[PDB]
Design a protein around this ligand. Structure first.
Ligand code: HEM
Ligand SMILES: CC(C)c1nc(CN(C)C(=O)N[C@H](C(=O)N[C@@H](Cc2ccccc2)C[C@H](O)[C@@H](N)Cc2ccccc2)C(C)C)cs1
Length: 449
C-alpha cells in the first residue's frame, strides 16, 4: 500500500508503517496541505493510515474530477465511520442511491421555493434584530454563534418542515442543544478495518441520545403534516407514495445540521471581518441603505442587487472555506490529464490551500472584498475557488445558504454596527481540530445605528 506513490512517481511526505502521514496532522489539516503544496507542487500523495490520498491543485484536473467524470469515476466521498441508519444520508450515499436522492431533493432549493421562503426567513430576521437590540441596550459582549445559531435553527426548521420551534425566544432550546452535541477518528483512520466491526456493536459518532430526539422530532413533524406549500418535508412525503421512514429522518438530520451550523459559523466569521475592517462594514451599510431606503424589508430581487454584499460573503468564504478539502474516491483505474489514477485512491482538492495561493490571489492573506468585483470576477478560477465544491455533487444547499446569510446580514446591518472589544480575539486564530472553527468564540460589541 505504502509504496503506491513511489511507484507512480508522485512526490509526498514519507509514511510511517500503519500510521501513514497521520502525525503531520498535529498542526492541523490546513497547514499540512499548505506545506505539502509549497514543498511538492501541483500534485502530491500521502497516506491517511493505510488510505492513499492524492492531492491535486491544477484547475483542469479538478474540473475533470469534480465535473466531467463525476458519474463514471469520481461519484462518492470517502466511506464514513460507524454511522447506523445515517448510512442513508445523501452525503454518504453511493452511486445510484446517491443519484436518486440527489434527484429527489434537488427541487428543495429552486428559485421559486427560495422566493417563497424570503417572507418566512424575514420574520426571524426581525426577531434576531429584536434579540440583538436588547443586548445592545446593555453594551454586553455578544457571542454571535449562539444568536446566529438560534436564528439558523428557526429558519431551517420552518423552511424545511413548516414548524416554528421558536429557538430565538427559547434559551433552553432542545433542538440547538441536541443538534450541536451531535459532533476517535484518529484511531479509526489508523484502523478503518474497524468501522465494519462497529455495525455489529451499533455504536455511533453522535450519541444515541441526540438521534433518538431528532428521529422522534421529525417523525412528529411528518405526522403533523399528514393530519400547504411543498417543502423539503413534502418532497420526501410525496416520494413515499421510494423513501423509507429512516431514510426520510436521515436526510432531515443532514439538512438540520447543515442549516444550523454552517450558516451560523460563516455568519460569525463575516461579522468578525466587518468588525475588524470598519471601512468594509461602513461601505456594506451604504449599499444596503441605498438598495433598501429607509430600512425597507429585504426581498428576493433586492438581495440580488447587492453587489458589495455578495463580494463580502465571497471573500469571507475564500478565507474561511468551512469544508477545507473536497474529496472523491477513484472508483476504477483512470488516466486524466496525462496522469494515472488507481482505483480506491482518494482524490483530494485542498480548497483552503488553494484559496490562499499567491499564484492565484494577490495578497491572499488579506480580507479584500474588491477581489470579487465585476472588474476581477474574471481573474478568479472556479476550480481554485471552491467554498461550495463543484459539479454534480456540490453543496446542494448553496443558494439556501447564501440567501439565508445575506438576509440575516441585511437585517442586522440595517440596525446595528459591530465593533471589537476587550473580548475579541484579534488575529482570530483557528481551532486545530478537523472542523474550521475559531480557537475562541467570536465576541463583538453591537451598537445601534
Ligand atoms: C455557507 C454554508 C455552506 C457551505 C460553505 C457548504 C459547503 C459545502 C461543501 C464544500 C460541500 C462538499 C461539496 C463537494 O464535495 O463538491 C457541501 C455538501 C453538501 N451540503 Fe453544504 N455548505 C453549506 C451549507 C449547506 C446547507 C444550509 C445545507 C442544507 C440545507 C447543505 C447541504 C449539503 C448537502 C446535503 C451536501 C452533500 C450533497 C451531496 O452529497 O449530494 N449545505 N457543502
Ligand atoms: C472537514 C471535512 C474534511 C470533514 N468533516 C467530516 C465530519 N463532518 C463533520 C461532516 O459534517 N461530514 C459530512 C456531512 O454529511 N456533513 C454535513 C452535515 C452533517 C454530517 C454528519 C452529521 C450531521 C450533519 C455538512 C454539510 O452538509 C456541508 N454543508 C458542510 C461540510 C461539507 C463537507 C465537509 C465539511 C463540511 C460528510 C462528508 C461525512 C468528515 S470530513
Amino acid at each position: 500500500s505504502h509504496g503506491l506513490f513511489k511507484k507512480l512517481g508522485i512526490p509526498g511526505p514519507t509514511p510511517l508503517p500503519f500510521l501513514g502521514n497521520i502525525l503531520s496532522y498535529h498542526k492541523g489539516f490546513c497547514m499540512f496541505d499548505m506545506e505539502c503544496h509549497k514543498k511538492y507542487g501541483k500534485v502530491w500523495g500521502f497516506y491517511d493510515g493505510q488510505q492513499p490520498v492524492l492531492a491535486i491543485t491544477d484547475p483542469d484536473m479538478i474540473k475533470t474530477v469534480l465535473v466531467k467524470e463525476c458519474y463514471s469515476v469520481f461519484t462518492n466521498r470517502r466511506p464514513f465511520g460507524p454511522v447506523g441508519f445515517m448510512k442513508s444520508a445523501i452525503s454518504i450515499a453511493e452511486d445510484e442511491e446517491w443519484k436518486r436522492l440527489r434527484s429527489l431533493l434537488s427541487p428543495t432549493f429552486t428559485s421559486g421555493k427560495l422566493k417563497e421562503m424570503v417572507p418566512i426567513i424575514a420574520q426571524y430576521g426581525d426577531v434576531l434584530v429584536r434579540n440583538l437590540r436588547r443586548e445592545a441596550e446593555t453594551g454586553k459582549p455578544v457571542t454571535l454563534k449562539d444568536v446566529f445559531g438560534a436564528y439558523s435553527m428557526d429558519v431551517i426548521t420552518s423552511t424545511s418542515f413548516g414548524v416554528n420551534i421558536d429557538s430565538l425566544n427559547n434559551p433552553q432550546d432542545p433542538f440547538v442543544e441536541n443538534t450541536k452535541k451531535l459532533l476517535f477518528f484518529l484511531s479509526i483512520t489508523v484502523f478503518p478495518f474497524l468501522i465494519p466491526i462497529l455495525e455489529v456493536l451499533n455504536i455511533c459518532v453522535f450519541p444515541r441520545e441526540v438521534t433518538n430526539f431528532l428521529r422522534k422530532s421529525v417523525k412528529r413533524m411528518k405526522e403533523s403534516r399528514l393530519e400547504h406549500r411543498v417543502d423539503f418535508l413534502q418532497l420526501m412525503i410525496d416520494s413515499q407514495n421510494a423513501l423509507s421512514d429512516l431514510e426520510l429522518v436521515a436526510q432531515s438530520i443532514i439538512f438540520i445540521f447543515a442549516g444550523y451550523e454552517t450558516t451560523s459559523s460563516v455568519l460569525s466569521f463575516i461579522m468578525y471581518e466587518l468588525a475588524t475592517h470598519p471601512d468594509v462594514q461602513q461601505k456594506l451599510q451604504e449599499e444596503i441603505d441605498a438598495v433598501l431606503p429607509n430600512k425597507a424589508p429585504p426581498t428576493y430581487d433586492t438581495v440580488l442587487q447587492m453587489e458589495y454584499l455578495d463580494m463580502v460573503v465571497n471573500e469571507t468564504l475564500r478565507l474561511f472555506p468551512i469544508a477545507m478539502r473536497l474529496e472523491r474516491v477513484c472508483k476504477k483505474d483512470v488516466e486524466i490529464n496525462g496522469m494515472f489514477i488507481p482505483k480506491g485512491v482518494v482524490v483530494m482538492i485542498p480548497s483552503y490551500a488553494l484559496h490562499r495561493d499567491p499564484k492565484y490571489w494577490t495578497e491572499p492573506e488579506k480580507f479584500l472584498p474588491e477581489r470579487f468585483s465585476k472588474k476581477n470576477k474574471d481573474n478568479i478560477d472556479p476550480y481554485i475557488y471552491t467554498p461550495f465544491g463543484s459539479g454534480p455533487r456540490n453543496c446542494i444547499g448553496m443558494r439556501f445558504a447564501l440567501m439565508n446569510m445575506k438576509l440575516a446580514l441585511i437585517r442586522v446591518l440595517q440596525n446595528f454596527s459591530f465593533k471589537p472589544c476587550k473580548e475579541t480575539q484579534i488575529p482570530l486564530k483557528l481551532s486545530l481540530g478537523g472542523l474550521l472553527q475559531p480557537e475562541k468564540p467570536v465576541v463583538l460589541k453591537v451598537e445601534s445605528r
